[PDB]
Amino acid sequence: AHFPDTPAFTGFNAPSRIECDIPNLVHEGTIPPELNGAFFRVQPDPQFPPRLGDDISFNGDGMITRFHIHDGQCDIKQRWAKTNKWKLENAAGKALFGSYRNPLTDDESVKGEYRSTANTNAFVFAGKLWAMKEDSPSLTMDPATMETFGFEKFGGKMTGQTFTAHPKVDPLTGNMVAIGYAASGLCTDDVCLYEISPDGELIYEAWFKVPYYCMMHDFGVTKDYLVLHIVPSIGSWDRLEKGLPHFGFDTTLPVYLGIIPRRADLKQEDIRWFKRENCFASHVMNAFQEGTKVHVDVPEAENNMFPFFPDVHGAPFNPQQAMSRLTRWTVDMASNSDEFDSVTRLTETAGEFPRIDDRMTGLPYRYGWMLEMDMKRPVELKGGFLMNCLFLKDHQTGAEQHWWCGPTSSLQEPAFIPRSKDAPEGDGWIVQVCNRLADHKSDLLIFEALDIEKGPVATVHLPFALRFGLHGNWANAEEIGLAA
Amino acid sequence: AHFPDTPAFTGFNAPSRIECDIPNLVHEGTIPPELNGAFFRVQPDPQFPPRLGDDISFNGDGMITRFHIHDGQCDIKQRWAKTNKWKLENAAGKALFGSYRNPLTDDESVKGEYRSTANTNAFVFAGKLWAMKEDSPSLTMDPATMETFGFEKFGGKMTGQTFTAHPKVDPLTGNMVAIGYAASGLCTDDVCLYEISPDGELIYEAWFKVPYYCMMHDFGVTKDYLVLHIVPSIGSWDRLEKGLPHFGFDTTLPVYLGIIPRRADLKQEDIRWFKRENCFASHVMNAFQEGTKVHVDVPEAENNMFPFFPDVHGAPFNPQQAMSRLTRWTVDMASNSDEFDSVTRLTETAGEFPRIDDRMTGLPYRYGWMLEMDMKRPVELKGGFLMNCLFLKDHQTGAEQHWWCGPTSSLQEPAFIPRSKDAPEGDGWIVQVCNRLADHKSDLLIFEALDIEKGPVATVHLPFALRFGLHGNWANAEEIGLAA
Ligand SMILES: [Co+2]
Ligand SMILES: [Co+2]
């Protein structure tokens, strides 16, 4: 393959496309013999050179990595998420879909097809692996063999056209809670709220509209509510006609937080929209209710964090204003006005990729993990935020822990592994990929989840480099068809 | 896996164990659209940590790499050679066989089993892929799927216990010509000469004895003869009982060249042994007859080239005396004495891994390629000879060509690809793996075989590193079950 000599395709961003199997990877330290299951994660990774001769990171085809940890060892299985895009392009021997979220640039032969790369999450639910991209229904795969099934539309019961890549699992029921924005077509203001039972059946789909179409990438869930931030990374058909990146950031629009009842009978008038000044947030650590209040914890930045989705008024990207810090947004359902009850920064540590012990989804919670950018640390190699620490916040005491991966490495999203179903919150392990940039390889690190400063208790070496990852998740073996 | 922190297992020698598939590898330049077939090569690569807690490079399990070149692209498929050793150890989850060529160190559970790692050659003949190790019968594999068949003993017609990893194909018949030393058991002085027809049937097996047991790694073949150098890298049960490496070099023993008739009716008295002073040679570029003379071209060194098989009298390894240079050994079957007719250095370039256009096997020939060690070139990274150039010798004119891979890379064995069945000698391409040590990755280089100084016409990037390789070979698609 002839790929462009551009940053999105070179160095740490060289295409990989490795499908492989390696059991019993070389490792150091002690892999807890308690562990029996797998960590799935996804990297965008281009099957073919881009039609336009360049592209962005978020547009690579999804390649799924599974780390099966059992018997004190770690194995890897890596396979493509075989979306319809992947299949059509594979058969044609070339790219057929064009630029990111831009159907105007697709070959006529694939007009009308799902454009999903399934590249944003590798999530386990209902005995399946969900390879997810928020512009289409999710793809599903067999978590044991990593073969691909196809797109999930729930027996026809889903009529929205899209499905999130940030599903939540409500611990009170085991339901998957999901949204789909642009639900009636590209750039539309329609959103669906979906709930899926543990058996994988769609329980309900509820439609509503938002203040303006924007990237609704993530959201929170509580017992009673969908908690949906409206942040003006905006897109439009006009931008696409003009050849601009689908999304751009508008610093002049307000930010909203919508509180949407988790109810099949939802009507638009049931929704409350709280409004605040312009800012940026993408991911949700967790949300929860307290009395008549709703709290959501997000990495908040002053301005846009996506340089590739630039300021709509032509401002150059501002890295300083892109620094995000975990912040609690609180709104009171009993309040008279549409003002937030409070916005409270929870840490001065800058970071992203927030995670919790997912058994706490929607509940008051003590612990949060993030990838941290500590700009005070020495750096000799980079591979444009520098995510160089694992961070743990204790909301009960305020205490913070940090682990630095050293001056030639960076880190990918952590994921929490519970010791047992009814172990206390945070009792378990963190796993995360470490980019060993000087060695052009990756490690999988295993930490004691509440004692990270001493470093990983085990380091699994991969004999190749992973690419930049998006989201990932642990599942125990019994949830994924792997051996007891 | 917990591997030793020793040189044989770290850095460029880290275990890899990658089984993978990647079509359409990222590449630069122009892969000749004429090419349709595959280059197979083998790397020793340990499935498990060694029983003794250390080991040598030559003892890793064979991992087979196939580069399928077609339609102007290159694909990779990498699979284990599943020897009985591999299978038994895989089932046990641990090493069961011990040190190199040392059955005394094996677990009792595998006494009597073939110890082959099938790690020295990946050769195509009779519709099969031969994964070869000279201490056992060859393993065979399906060249298309790279599944393993098992050990080849030719329907019981082979009674020798071993088979070479340096088979030759006689162009006059298409027969495979092979030896097996230590043919009646470890360290024995019995050798078999085998010839196998193009259909894979054993034609004959002829037994003989040699002046002393030694590493009979390679040999030459001409129309009438097996040409067998006897070089005193010697082994014995006594060395193994004392815990020494199987082989050690004895500078006090003579070197012989045996001329053995290629005849099923061979008797010991039919063999002529020519004798010369101590020196070292391992590989054969080619051998051929001229009148009553036999010529064989070998990289000759003053002394041992294997630091891991040390001087039997305790001398430290001498790198200067280990420098090998292509040299013609000529013996006259009509001569009165046992002296060689001549020993003539053919180049001052130091090198190893000699190759020809294999259509010239046993015939007078014009071209030879080698890996060259040019100690005058700058080096910033190494990964203990530094093989940093591809070398081409023209025996007709004397002309030499060199291509240097640069200061942070090294090279693996080249292989010649003919343009067509009746293309002239040397009309075609050279392929070879390049270790890009600074990038911790490998390239496959494609050269115009007689115009190497301009550099490769195509460079295929692998998104991971291969390990040190041994021998490899090209076959056209029709010889290996791949698409026309
Ligand atoms: Co996300
Ligand atoms: Co050899």
Author numbering:
A (entry chain A), B (entry chain A): 2 to 384, 389 to 489
Which lines from the publication concern this structure?
LSDs are nonheme iron enzymes that catalyze the O2-dependent cleavage of trans-4-hydroxystilbenes to yield two aromatic aldehydes. LSD4 catalyzed the cleavage of DCA-S to 5-formylferulate and vanillin and cleaved lignostilbene and DCA-S (∼106 M−1 s−1) with tenfold greater specificity than pterostilbene and resveratrol. The overall structure of LSD4 is typical of CCDs: a seven-bladed β-propeller fold with a cap-like feature on one face formed by extended loops.
To facilitate the structural characterization of LSD4·substrate complexes, we generated Co-LSD4 in which the catalytic Fe2+ was substituted with Co2+. This metal ion substitution in CAO1 yielded an inactive but isostructural enzyme. Co-LSD4 was produced by growing cells producing LSD4 in a minimal medium supplemented with Ca2+, Mg2+, and Co2+ as the only divalent metal ions. Inductively coupled plasma–mass spectrometry (ICP-MS) analysis revealed that each protomer of Co-LSD4 contained 0.92 ± 0.06 equivalents of Co2+ and ∼0.02 equivalents of Fe2+. Co-LSD4 had a faint purple hue and a λmax of ∼480 nm. Finally, incubating lignostilbene with Co-LSD4 led to rates of O2 consumption that were barely above background. This is consistent with Co-LSD4 being inactive, with residual activity in the preparation the result of trace Fe-LSD4. Co-LSD4 crystallized under similar conditions as native enzyme and the two structures were nearly identical, with an RMSD of 0.1 Å over 471 aligned Cα atoms.
